[PDB]
């Protein structure tokens, strides 16, 4: 499932298949989406037809951007895509290539009962070896799990002393393994076609969405994956490790805060509970559902403030495991990584234990708008002062 | 505790205490917020000081508007507040009394690191009997459980073929049982005061939020609470009942969709699993956390399509319970209500069973954007098509 | 209970009986299903005949795989079985031994009323010791508790960064304690036979399923 | 290790001993903690002396309340005890019997190194039937595993849409199997006594918490 040369004028669009460019003349790299789809060679988002009436829309994403965290949830087939107003100075819909206007118009159509105007959305993600793209699926606006009003939202971003709006758009990948290029090019030329995938026609007629849901097989992460890659994030975690060197137990509070960011409530927290080994037995309460229709489940918290050179092993994990006997699950927050043996034991024995490692802390901090050591410091000041 | 009359010029602001207006002349009520707070006579939101530099802000809500569902999450202290652009034809920030510009400015200050410009926000909810307000607390912009960018978002709402933008703001109630009227009036006028509540100063300095979290005690709902009130809603549910009378199973698919709306991932669904009584063992899979740091827990689904005259009783619930062996929890979705004995048997014991009744289905439908029987029919068509 | 060696070429197929492979020199166990039913030596999906006209269908599972949780409900006689595309990189229907194509075809036939095209399906589960199988019964596509659209479904799974598609199939074990090896081998060879168990014939004519339910 | 009647005016307070009964005129059940200790006849918390300077404090708990889960950990000897404001309508420190105020005064005292102002705390748990209590021990405010801010906290609860505040207080049981009734009664009367158990004096001088841990 790797396509490079003239094959791009023949092969269909296959989910998670890789479509690579080729060298033409003098350093010029041919964009594969041109023969594969028929769009232009340029944008991060590309369309056919006019902007007022687009016939087909191609969305590409790097997934390397921490500023605008586009993401494809393989599990639910949900694709989160951020708009094209990425810096201060211009209003929401005023962009050079009009991506926000496009998004607005598409969601307008989808919501107003005119789905026939909505162009097929083809999602691609860059593998970033020269110019290559992995096809992620055919998508529709909205989601079966979201409120109607929350599928296209305008967020306020703050960068270098200024406030500007940008779109966060939610799409759902339809359950289709193969998208006929005949259909793509036909619709792209403005033609009417009967080669439309069943899920697409279904969405057209009824408005309903059949998502491509691909739950992850059991995963054991490596050391590199759990620890930050860049030195900056490493500095970020280091600030945390330094904050609690004089008061280790205090880190639990921090863990708690991180937990509230990670978890679908605001977890209730009881961090002050003397346990048998002289340490504390931190516990939490989580609500599942939406009151009046919801239940509460309890979890045990375990926080290990370690250096990256010191792994979390079988012993540390076994503490938490022993603490989750009468509780639904456990969360383990650590500024380091969990070694092979412990991870393997946890995934294999099916223990309900969340493993939040250093990289995860970095991500959670990113979502909280903390990208710099000073910001980490202020954040920690906030935690210590608020508990 | 209850307060009215001249005492509104003396007593402090107490969480969940009731402040009632008194008859002066016309047969209408003198608004209690004028003597108690010092704000003007009327408003959905009221502020002292200027528009550009408000010294104090009072947010009131009736919690009775289904189209703009302001919400006080008592468990977590989160207050969701909807902006003042509630009809089409006007730009987001262009409103008669400038609520959205005000919210914009407040969150701007909070985000740009200027919290000394942010006025204390006082939250009141209407008791709907005469003109009275229960005081909910002192609030700050934002939440410790949310991403930075999502504390103030612009939603698109659809009305009569038109689409307009409106604000959704997230606030958090600080942990303070009593807010001093001396401090409130001082800041209102306003001058420097040292009477500021500790949590407020804490937020001013470090940016940390110490939320008032008051988990709900064990509750058993009544028949009237579980069932819809207005006849329109009753009609909405009746459409669902009529839709499946020729095919009783397959309402399981509907219950599965509603489940996907109720639950914090998009739950994976396996509805086709022959069970011992000749029926099915519907199960789902739900993710807690954010991958790579997340776990999956499974649940048992039980779908009971009943008329409002037939309660879900001990036996059906028992079927669910039996199906919960070797599973984390269970969800019961029903177009009717659960009788006293069954509800009591569920809450008294430790059964992790979510009870989704008719009113809850009504709510989930509101959030999906379905308020009319035609729309219910379109929705159902979508469900049947998408399974 | 308990058959091995030469007896694998003599005795019938009995539900819950254990058929054990025997040691051969140089390289370990010989598969018991070869002398028993007459299929190929390996695979979790085995068949006789051709792709276009399968004569016999053997399904084996260990019930120990968490990624593909095959299931055997002795209360309803229901057998939930997963397809043979278990690694990323290939489309649902594209498998070396053509298991998914066969499943799709068999279920299509079953749903259309073409029951006479559906080969007998023998279900085995693996046991403790090396290369042994406990026979669970003769089975048919579908379930009395499921509609046609419900008994064969395509599921997705993400291994590494790649999503791939595979089949989840629902079968029902027929109420027959003994399945004649004469019928098995006759049918497998492509011969036409009248030795079919009663429940199978009832399925062929009436379309009705008498499941094997444990008391 | 079971005492009743006249015995309640004789024996000492012993850890794990049960103090029960007893029957009286009409249907009245006499409270054992009255002859045994000298406090009042009821209250989830009872005390002697002024509320401004309490001489002796008795805490009882059934450990049967899910809404206010009082907990006694025998591994660490830790006693988690909830305040006396259990219903909406009153502020945290405004209660009929003034328990939360007492708790606050006690804990602030302990925090300031003013241990000598802290009255002895006797912990009893209710058993099964009738009016009976199991004596769990003599306890001091706080824990060797907790900082000062951590041992007394305010919690919130929502009931009937109304939110109210209550106290979660952590005590630690001192390692003493037997507490002299002479000492208890002497202290309760406000007299100076030198009969205090060694762990209590060690807490007074150093503090210095020697917890009672089950082997």
TrEMBL record, chains A, B:
Residues 29-207 form the Restriction endonuclease AspBHI N-terminal domain. GO terms for biological process: DNA restriction-modification system. Residues 247-364 form the Restriction endonuclease type IV Mrr domain. This is Restriction endonuclease. It holds the Pfam family Mrr_cat. GO terms for molecular function: DNA binding; endonuclease activity. InterPro entries: RE_AspBHI_N, Restrct_endonuc_IV_Mrr, tRNA_endonuc-like_dom_sf. The lineage of its organism: Bacteria, Pseudomonadati, Pseudomonadota, Betaproteobacteria, Rhodocyclales.
